[PDB]
Amino acid sequence: MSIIVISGCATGIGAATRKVLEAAGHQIVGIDIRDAEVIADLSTAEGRKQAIADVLAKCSKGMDGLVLCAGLGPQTKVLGNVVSVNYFGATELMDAFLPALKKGHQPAAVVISSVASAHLAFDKNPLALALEAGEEAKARAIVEHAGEQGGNLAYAGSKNALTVAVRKRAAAWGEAGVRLNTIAPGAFVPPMGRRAEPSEMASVIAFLMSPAASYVHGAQIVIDGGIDAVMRPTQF
Amino acid sequence: MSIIVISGCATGIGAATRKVLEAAGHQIVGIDIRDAEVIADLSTAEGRKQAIADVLAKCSKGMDGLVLCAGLGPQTKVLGNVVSVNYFGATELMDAFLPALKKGHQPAAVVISSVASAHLAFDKNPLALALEAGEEAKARAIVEHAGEQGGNLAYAGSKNALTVAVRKRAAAWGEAGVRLNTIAPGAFVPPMGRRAEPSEMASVIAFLMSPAASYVHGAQIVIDGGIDAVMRPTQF
């Protein structure tokens, strides 16, 4: 009776989030290339469109939540997919699911960005304009024609653009009565002295999807053991 | 058994937090001008020194947590007190209590800053250097001689410096095994367009003080119903 849609549910944080939310009594409709109710490859427009239709077909009466965990990191073989999945795989889905979310009970959504979103300024983001304008081919070309790196550009650039996109939707989602927040997993040795377990990302998402976070909206919760605080003490 | 020290426990968020953590089974050692185990006024150096001594005497075996909710808003008659309580009332206590927290079980601390902490850049904060240097008289003089909007300066200035102070302690606190984060209040039912109840701040603090936030350290969690996102979409 309480459906929550989760992209990237097959592995990592997405898988760990499915576990915690199911323990809370939610019915999950997952989206991924495998081990998911909705099989889809979010790297292309056609793939996302079909995914959206497949999900909405199962949520004609609405959904209570949405968690977008699909994502590709640097080193990804084809860099164009990093931009497509990380940005459009999130933005097109959250935008298409808002109507359904609006009908839900205490509706909320969480988007997995990255601390890398703070490694660049949006106005200095080579992908910013293209991504905001919905120019996917252009954005993919940029990273595929990137200099030495390219991977960090596609990753940091897409995540930075993603966080800003979520914050720019705060007003509209607030009017619709749906909370929308992001978490930013870390990406040397953190002050807390260890690497995180996906479960530690999922527990924060569970908090953000619950009434305990009733007044939390449009925020980005950094989960990195303290690295960001050490690197950017004066920036928040 | 499990002691949690809470400053500003008599009213508002401090009171709401005390209720939630007490329900969680914690023994609370409150610090406030009234209705507290430790009666103290944190506006003076001697007052804080005495409060620290009185608290440590009750936590000889350590403490499991610390929540600093003491604070004064703009428009407080004597602006010097805003700086003293908001900054030193927090920094001297957390620094003095670290040894005790270090001895605790899954120790964590939460400091209540404000969304106002982001309304001024640390490098452009007229109180920054004085506060960091521990020059209380100098800092108080700055706001009491500011004239127009000296109240906003005292408030935004102390809170900005506070959030930076907490972030610069991330490395040391992490090495000590104690998590340290801030919440940034702004001012069921959708949050946008309404004020929050103190309980909605306390529920986030409860989360930050629990294992669910095991990898959250040095972070500032904004709890404002989305206002900050609307105002600063590209800053986070």
Return the residue matching tokens 């969304």: B115
Q: State whether residue B226 sits within 8 Å of chain A by CB.
A: yes
Q: Which of A176, A26, A5, A27 is nearest to A102 (CA)?
A: A176
Q: How far is CA B166 from the centre of its chain?
A: 9
- Residues contacting residue A220 through CB under 8 Å, at least 6 positions apart: A113, A117, A163, A166, A167, A181, A182, A183, A184, B236
In terms of DSSP bridges, do strands A27-32 and A108-112 run parallel, antiparallel, or are they unpaired?
unpaired
Are the C-beta atoms of residues A114 and A185 closer than 8 Å to each other? yes
DSSP B76: -
Question: Which residues in chain A are closer than 8 Å to B117, comparing Cβ atoms?
Answer: 236
In which order are the strands placed within the sheet that holds B3-7? Answer: B38-39, B27-32, B3-7, B65-68, B108-112, B179-185, B220-223
d(CA A75, CA A55): 30
Residue pointed to by tokens 């040397």 = A188
**Cα angle: A218, vertex A221, A223; to 5 degrees:** 160
User: Is residue B97 within 8 Å of residue B53, measured between CB atoms?
Assistant: no
DSSP secondary structure letter of residue B87: I
Burial class (CB in 10 A: 0-12, 13-18, 19+), A70: buried
The answer to whether B59 touches B27, Cβ cutoff 8 Å, is no
Q: What type of residue is A197? A: E
The answer, for A171 touching chain B at a CB cutoff of 8 Å, is yes
Q: What is the dihedral of CA B13, B16, B18, B21, to 10 degrees?
A: -110
Tokens at B129, concatenated: 């250097």
Residue B29 · residue B20 · CB < 8 Å: no
Give how many domains chain A has, as a whole number.
1
DSSP 8-class letter at B197: P
CATH number at residue B202: 3.40.50.720
Nearest chain B residue to A174 by CA distance is: B192
Task: Kindly provide the resolution of this structure in angstroms, with one decimal.
Answer: 1.7
Binding-site positions of A for NAD(+) read 8-13, 32, 41-42, 71, 155, 159
Q: What is the rounded CA–CA span in Å between residue A91 and residue A6?
A: 14
Nearest to B142 by CA among B72, B82, B77: B82
Question: Which residues of B are tagged catalytic?
Answer: 155
Q: Does B92 touch chain A (CB under 8 A)?
A: no
Q: How far is it, in rounded angstroms, from Cα B149 to Cα B147? A: 6
Q: What is the distance between the alpha carbons of residues B107 and B92, in angstroms, rounded to a whole number?
A: 18
Question: Tokens 């953000």 belong to which residue?
Answer: A208
DSSP designation for B9? T
Contacts of B20 in chain A (CB under 8 A): none
Structure tokens at B35: 């209705």
| Distance (Å) from the alpha carbon of A190 to chain B's nearest alpha carbon | 8
Question: Maximum CA pair distance of chain A?
Answer: 50
- CA gap A213, B158 in Å, rounded: 26
The one-letter code for the residue type at B186 is G
Domain span including residue A63: 1-236
Q: How close B165 comes to chain A (CA, Å)?
A: 8
The three-state (H, E, C) secondary structure of chain A, written as one string: CCEEEEECCCCHHHHHHHHHHHCCCCEEEEEECCCCCEECCCCCHHHHHHHHHHHHHHCCCCCCEEEECCCCCCCCCCHHHHHHHHHHHHHHHHHHHHHHHHHCCCCEEEEECCHHHHCCCHHHCCCHHHHHCCCHHHHHHHHHCCCCCCHHHHHHHHHHHHHHHHHCCHHHHHHCCCEEEEEEECCCCCCCCCCCCHHHHHHHHHHHCCHHHCCCCCCEEEECCCHHHHHCCCCC
Number of H helices, E strands in chain B: 10, 7
Residue B231, classified by CB atoms within 10 Å of its CB into exposed (0-12), middle (13-18) or buried (19+), is middle
What experimental approach yielded this model?
A: X-ray
- To 5 degrees, how large is the angle CA A96–CA A99–CA A104? 125
- What separation in angstroms does the CA of A128 have from each of A111, A149, A218? 18, 18, 19
- Kindly report the number of other CB atoms within 10 A of residue B53's CB atom: 12
